[PDB]
C-alpha cells in the first residue's frame, strides 16, 4: 500500500470505532460498525495470498451477518419504543438479537470459530488490530445496554468463552492461533462481570489490550509466528525472552503481576453479589490458559532449544523494527499491581 493510503485506512478504522463510542443514535452506531468493517478488510488483504483472502472472506461474512442482526434489533426497538436513543432496549427480542450480534462481533463462543482462523490468516500487525482495537466498539455498546441484557444469556456466553478459549489453546503450536484462543478466554471475563459492575469490564479490557499489544509487538520484533521459531529467540535477543516470560506470566494472572488485577477485581464484584460458584469455576478454568502460556515460556525462556548454524549470521545485525511503545507497554503489563486503586479513574 501507498503509505499515505495506509494511514488514511487506519484512521478510518479508528473513526468507525470513535463514531460508535460518541453516538447517541442507533443508526450512527450501526454506521460506525459499517465504516470500521470496510476499512479493516484492506489491512487483512494487504499481503495478497490465498490464506489472507480466505480470512478476509470469513471475516466479512461473520461481521456482515452480525451487522444485519444488529440492525434488526434496532428496528424492533424502534417499533416498540418509537425512538433511536442508544440506551437500554425496550423489547426482549431486540435485546437477544443485539447481544448475539455483539457476541458474534467479539468472537465469543459459540460464535468463536472465525477468530482462530482469521487471526492465523493475516499478518501479525493486522492480528494486533483485530484482537485489540476491534473489541472497543462492541464493548462500548455492551457497556450501555447491559441493564436490558438477559442475565442467563450473557453469563452463558461468558462461561462457554472461558471454556472454549482455554481448551482451544491447549492444542496450538501457531502463535497467532494461541493469541486468538487467549482472546476468546479473556473475552469471557469481561462479559461475566458486565451485569454486576461494568467498570470492571473496562478495567479488564484495558489491561488485556496492553498485554496483548505487548505480545504481538514482541512477536513482530523477531518475525515469529510459530512456537518453534520463537524458540530461537534466546540465541538472538536474550532480553526479549525475559520480557516474553514476564508478560506470559502476567497474562496467566499470576501475582504479583498486572494480569492478576482484573481477575482479582472481577472475583470481588461477583462475590459481593453472592455469586460464589461462578467466579470459582472461572478462576479454576483459567488455569487452562496458564498452562499453554507456561508451555510457551518453557520453549522460549526457561530452556534452550536447538539452534541452527545460519543463526550466527543474524548476530551481526541489529534489530531495526520500530517496536513502538514496547518498553512502556511491558512495564505496564507487569508492574502495575501496586497501583490497583487507580481503577477508580474508570468510574
Amino acid at each position: 500500500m501507498n503509505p499515505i493510503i495506509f494511514i488514511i485506512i487506519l484512521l478510518t478504522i479508528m473513526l468507525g470505532t470513535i463514531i460508535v463510542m460518541i453516538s447517541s443514535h442507533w443508526l450512527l452506531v450501526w454506521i460506525g460498525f459499517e465504516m470500521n468493517m470496510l476499512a479493516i478488510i484492506p489491512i487483512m488483504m494487504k499481503n495478497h495470498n490465498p490464506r489472507a483472502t480466505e480470512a478476509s472472506t470469513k471475516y466479512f461474512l461473520t461481521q456482515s451477518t452480525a451487522s444485519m442482526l444488529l440492525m434488526m434489533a434496532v428496528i424492533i426497538n424502534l417499533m416498540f419504543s418509537g425512538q433511536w436513543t442508544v440506551m437500554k432496549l425496550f423489547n426482549p427480542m431486540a435485546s437477544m438479537l443485539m447481544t448475539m450480534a455483539l457476541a458474534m462481533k467479539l468472537g465469543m463462543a459459540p460464535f468463536h470459530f472465525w477468530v482462530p482462523e482469521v487471526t492465523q490468516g493475516i499478518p501479525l500487525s493486522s492480528g494486533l488490530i483485530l484482537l485489540t482495537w476491534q473489541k472497543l466498539a462492541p464493548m462500548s455498546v455492551l457497556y450501555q445496554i447491559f441493564p436490558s441484557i438477559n442475565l442467563n444469556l450473557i453469563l452463558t456466553l461468558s462461561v462457554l468463552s472461558i471454556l472454549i478459549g482455554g481448551w482451544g489453546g491447549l492444542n496450538q503450536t501457531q502463535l497467532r492461533k494461541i493469541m486468538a484462543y487467549s482472546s476468546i478466554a479473556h473475552m469471557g471475563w469481561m462479559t461475566a462481570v458486565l451485569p454486576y459492575n461494568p467498570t470492571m469490564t473496562l478495567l479488564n479490557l484495558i489491561i488485556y489490550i496492553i498485554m496483548t499489544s505487548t505480545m504481538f509487538t514482541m512477536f513482530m520484533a523477531n518475525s515469529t509466528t510459530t512456537t518453534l521459531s520463537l524458540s530461537h529467540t534466546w540465541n538472538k535477543t536474550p532480553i526479549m525472552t525475559v520480557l516474553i516470560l514476564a508478560t506470559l506470566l502476567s497474562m496467566g494472572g499470576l501475582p504479583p503481576l498486572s494480569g492478576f488485577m482484573p481477575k482479582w477485581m472481577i472475583i470481588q464484584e461477583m462475590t459481593k453479589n453472592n455469586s460464589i460458584i461462578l467466579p470459582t469455576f472461572m478462576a479454576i478454568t483459567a488455569l487452562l490458559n496458564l498452562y499453554f502460556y507456561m508451555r510457551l515460556t518453557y520453549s522460549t525462556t526457561l530452556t534452550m532449544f536447538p539452534s541452527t548454524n545460519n543463526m550466527k549470521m543474524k548476530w551481526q545485525f541489529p534489530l531495526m523494527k520500530k517496536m513502538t511503545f514496547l518498553p512502556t507497554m511491558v512495564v505496564l503489563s507487569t508492574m502495575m499491581l501496586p497501583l490497583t486503586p487507580m481503577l477508580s479513574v474508570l468510574e
Partner: protein, 98 residues
C-alpha cells in the same frame, strides 16, 4: 402488530436461515445477505412512514447506501476468491483449518 409485519419478519427470518445454511456458491449466500437488507429496508420504511416520524424518513436511504457499499466489498472478495480457485465455492476456503 399489524398483519404486514408478520410477512416482513418472516422474510427476514427466511433470508437469515438462507444465509446461515450455505450450499456451494458464495454468490448464493451474498444474495441472502442482500435479501436481509431488503427486508430491513421495508420494515424500517413501514414503521417510519406509518408513524409520521418525519426526520426518520432519511434513515432507509442511509441503510440502503451503506448496505450496497458493503455488498460491493463482498462482491470484490468473491471475485478475488474466484481468481484464486476459478470458482466461488466455499469448500475451497478451508486452508485456515490448519
Amino acid at each position: 402488530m399489524s398483519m404486514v409485519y408478520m410477512n416482513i419478519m418472516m422474510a427476514f427470518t427466511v433470508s437469515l436461515v438462507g444465509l446461515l445454511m450455505y450450499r456451494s456458491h458464495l454468490m448464493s449466500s451474498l444474495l441472502c445477505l442482500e435479501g436481509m437488507m431488503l427486508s430491513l429496508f421495508v420494515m424500517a420504511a413501514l414503521t417510519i412512514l406509518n408513524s409520521h416520524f418525519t426526520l426518520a424518513s432519511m434513515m432507509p436511504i442511509i441503510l440502503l447506501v451503506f448496505a450496497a457499499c458493503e455488498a460491493a466489498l463482498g462482491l470484490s472478495l468473491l471475485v478475488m476468491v474466484s481468481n484464486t480457485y476459478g470458482t466461488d465455492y466455499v469448500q475451497n476456503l478451508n486452508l485456515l483449518q490448519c
